[PDB]
């Protein structure tokens, strides 16, 4: 059993939230490949657990060919989802940082958290990451700064995972 596999801790944590923000940068996108596959499998066969309803995926990429296989995986998943009546389950943004649209540059995280927040009031959002320690700081800060103690407040819970 792998942490990034169907019965791994990371996969279980991801499935415990109604909505999640998954961020994978560079080689850090690799674990998410197995996680996305397992989540799609569970969604189609796991009657006993129906918690996860929405995935916001962020891919920070420098070399587009090095992980060409990951892009194909995203299209594959996206296709299967549109098929079995579930397009909208996954929304992904790809950022080419070398210098479902693909953008050049890095995201404005403050803007991203606000948008997601406004779309899911009174929701506990799990935030996950596999990438540079700095990006972890940013996500942590944003997660806290964008959460609200109010009744309709949104909660961004950054989950540490041992990839
Ligand atoms: Ni194992
Ligand atoms: Ni496993
Ligand atoms: Ni378990
Ligand atoms: Ni090659
Ligand atoms: Ni350069
Ligand atoms: Ni709700
Ligand atoms: Ni609350």
From Swiss-Prot:
Top-level division of the source organism's lineage: Eukaryota
Chain residues that bind NADPH: 27, 62, 97, 106
Disulfide feature: none
Subcellular localization(s) per the UniProt record: Cell membrane
PTM per Swiss-Prot/TrEMBL: Glycosylated.
Expression sites by tissue: Detected in neutrophils (at protein level).
Covalent link Glycyl lysine isopeptide (Lys-Gly) (interchain with G-Cter in ubiquitin), residues: 160
Coiled-coil residue windows: none
Effect seen on changing residue 163 to A: Moderately decreases superoxide-generating NADPH oxidase activity
Disease tied to this protein: Granulomatous disease, chronic, X-linked: A form of chronic granulomatous disease, a primary immunodeficiency characterized by severe recurrent bacterial and fungal infections, along with manifestations of chronic granulomatous inflammation. It results from an impaired ability of phagocytes to mount a burst of reactive oxygen species in response to pathogens. Immunodeficiency 34: A form of Mendelian susceptibility to mycobacterial disease, a rare condition characterized by predisposition to illness caused by moderately virulent mycobacterial species, such as Bacillus Calmette-Guerin (BCG) vaccine, environmental non-tuberculous mycobacteria, and by the more virulent Mycobacterium tuberculosis. Other microorganisms rarely cause severe clinical disease in individuals with susceptibility to mycobacterial infections, with the exception of Salmonella which infects less than 50% of these individuals.
Oligomer status and interactors: Component of the phagocyte NADPH oxidase core complex/cytochrome b558 complex, composed of CYBB (heavy chain (beta)) and CYBA (light chain (alpha)). Component of the phagocyte NADPH oxidase complex composed of an obligatory core heterodimer formed by the membrane proteins CYBA and CYBB and the cytosolic regulatory subunits NCF1/p47-phox, NCF2/p67-phox, NCF4/p40-phox and the small GTPase RAC1 or RAC2. Interacts with NCF1 (phosphorylated form). Interacts with NCF2; the interaction is enhanced in the presence of GBP7. Interacts with RAC2. Interacts with RAC1.
Functional note: Catalytic subunit of the phagocyte NADPH oxidase complex that mediates the transfer of electrons from cytosolic NADPH to O2 to produce the superoxide anion (O2(-)). In the activated complex, electrons are first transferred from NADPH to flavin adenine dinucleotide (FAD) and subsequently transferred via two heme molecules to molecular oxygen, producing superoxide through an outer-sphere reaction.
Name this protein carries in UniProt: NADPH oxidase 2
UniProt source species: Homo sapiens
